[PDB]
């Protein structure tokens, strides 16, 4: 006889989950590609005082 | 809705109850002219009227 409960205490702990997740895969994503393009970067400005 | 006057017990939780129901099969649980040979099953209301 506590149906509504039930459905609101498992809309609380899917609608947490679902967030938590999304933030961890765009973490990682964002990330990734900064590392990459930092590597870059440095290989350039290794390249530039050997140059001057 | 519930023409004569009253209260209905736990009625949202009904509402929660029909809300993952597809189809309903309506039969008869007890038989009007058969189950109840001593007591009179004629009883009307003006408070739910029908046709005038």
Same mark, same amino acid.
């Given at each position: 006889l506590e149906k509504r409960m039930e459905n609101l205490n498992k809309k609380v702990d899917d609608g947490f989950l679902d967030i938590w997740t999304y933030n961890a895969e765009l973490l990682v994503l964002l990330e990734n590609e900064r590392t990459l393009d930092f590597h870059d970067s440095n290989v350039k400005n290794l390249y530039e005082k050997v140059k001057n | 809705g519930t023409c004569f006057p009253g209260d209905f017990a736990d009625y949202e939780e009904l509402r929660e109850q029909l809300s993952s129901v597809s189809s309903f099969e309506r039969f008869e649980i007890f038989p009007k002219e058969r189950?109840?040979?001593?007591? /009179? /099953?004629?009883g009307v209301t003006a408070a739910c009227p029908h046709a005038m």
């Open positions: - | 189950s109840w040979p001593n007591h /009179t /099953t004629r």
